[PDB]
């Protein structure tokens, strides 16, 4: 419930672990798409929304029409950022300790004209 990842091992009918060492091996091989698959699609991977105007977690819902940033009542500019529920929990826990995490989305880039 907390992290959203599979449960632990065969005893709980969960998944199997790919610890830090496996991630080091995969990064050394350069297998980033394999990492995406295993650690996001087969794991707690999720979509998180951040307001570009203030770099804070926005509120977005397509089915029920919601497009809302708390800090930017108007002027909200929401972009969707691929993340992991574990990372979102990490950032929420950091915020819980009065540490304000501000995410700077990569700037938009345009051709000369």
């Amino acid at each position: 419930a907390l992290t959203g990842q599979p449960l632990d091992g065969k005893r709980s009918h969960g998944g199997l672990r790919l610890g830090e060492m496996e991630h080091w091996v995969l990064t050394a091989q350069g297998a980033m798409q394999t990492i995406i698959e295993k650690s996001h699609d087969d794991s707690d991977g999720c979509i998180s929304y951040i307001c570009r105007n203030c770099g804070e977690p926005a509120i977005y819902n397509a089915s029920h029409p919601i497009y809302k940033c708390m800090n930017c009542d108007v002027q909200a500019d929401i972009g969707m950022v691929d993340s992991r529920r574990s990372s979102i929990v990490f950032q929420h826990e950091m915020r819980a300790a009065n540490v304000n995490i501000t995410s700077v989305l990569s700037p938009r880039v345009f051709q000369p004209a």
Binding site: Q33, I36, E37, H40, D41, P65, I66, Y67, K68, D73, V74, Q75, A76, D77, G79, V81, D82, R108, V109, F110, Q111, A113
Partner: protein, 335 residues
């Protein structure tokens, strides 16, 4: 106020191979399906004009879907209702439960919550088109919504008028900015001519602060404006002409400027006294010439747009009869 604005956004391309077959056509179509008809960046988007700049069709790298994305900088036509704007047509949707709701029927959608504290508002009946004035508060353009949200009340003209203290002379560089505002009036003035002169007279007399009988129209070369009760027999100065003469070195406006209630707001007439020989309850406003001219120029557009919109809203006698109570309400406060 219809205007041009420039936006920046990112579009998700779900079928990059098919999208790139015709980028321009696909790009415009996607923008219209997403933004047109919604509030975005403290504005309401009416129609997309074009794309100023865009980016190549990048491919998402943080997920295993093959979808692409594109940054686009497009200019659209947006409407930003300010404070004190006059909305001619506001159909009441719900008056019961001491709650008065009305949605405008003009080019710029807006939902107005009319307070029940004022008695005049309670006179409104559901399904009746009634002119409204937006309150001093700013309009909330909640992003994503399909219409603005504001609060206003039935337009009862007020006698309280404000003088503005003019100290700095208007700079030719500043003049160029104002000429754009002047251009808006010219189009509005031309449109007013097309509307029959009989219908404008009824409404302008109704919303004139002072009661006036049928008299000779105070005709001007710019427009045939109506007459009014002269205050101190002063000579009004045609602001529209002034800017026209301002382009001819006639930029002397250091004296005081004001438009007392006895002036028909639509007509471009300004009583520029040398001194503050006004019944101004509040002290003159120490403002620059640009601030004053912009303040007064936008006032003309607000009222001029109001009259033209009134004629179109009420073009048959059946409707005018249906809202006799509304018209009579202005008479009660008429002074």
């Amino acid at each position: 106020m219809i205007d041009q604005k420039i936006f920046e956004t990112t579009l998700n391309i779900d079928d990059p191979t098919n999208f790139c077959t015709n980028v321009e056509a696909h790009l415009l179509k996607e923008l219209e399906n997403i933004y047109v008809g919604k509030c975005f960046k403290n504005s309401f988007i009416l129609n997309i004009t074009g794309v100023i700049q865009r980016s190549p069709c990048f491919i998402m790298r943080t997920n295993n879907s093959g979808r692409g994305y594109m940054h686009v900088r497009f200019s659209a036509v947006v409407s930003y209702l300010n404070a004190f704007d006059l909305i001619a047509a506001v159909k009441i949707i719900k008056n019961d439960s001491n709650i008065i709701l009305g949605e405008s029927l003009l080019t710029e959608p807006v939902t107005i919550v009319i307070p029940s504290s004022e008695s005049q508002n309670n006179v409104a009946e559901v399904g009746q088109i009634v002119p409204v004035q937006l309150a001093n508060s700013s309009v909330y353009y909640i992003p994503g919504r399909q219409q603005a949200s504001a609060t206003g009340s039935i337009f009862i003209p007020k006698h309280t008028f404000s003088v503005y203290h003019v100290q700095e002379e208007l700079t030719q560089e500043q003049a160029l900015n104002l000429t754009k505002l002047v251009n808006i009036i010219e189009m509005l003035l031309e449109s007013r001519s097309k509307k029959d002169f009989k219908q404008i007279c009824f409404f302008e007399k109704l919303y004139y602060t002072y009661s006036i009988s049928s008299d000779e129209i105070l005709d001007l070369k710019i427009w045939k404006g109506p007459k009014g009760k002269e205050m101190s027999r002063l000579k009004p100065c045609n602001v529209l002409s002034f800017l026209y003469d301002a382009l001819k070195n006639k930029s002397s406006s250091l004296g005081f400027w004001a438009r007392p209630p006895n002036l028909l707001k639509s007509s471009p007439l300004a009583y520029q006294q040398d001194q503050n020989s006004f019944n101004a309850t509040e002290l003159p406003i120490i403002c620059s010439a640009e601030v004053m001219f912009v303040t007064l120029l936008k006032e003309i557009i607000n009222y001029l747009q109001f009259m033209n919109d009134l004629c179109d809203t009420f073009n048959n006698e059946q409707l005018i009869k249906r809202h006799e109570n509304i018209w009579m309400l202005i008479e009660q406060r008429k002074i």
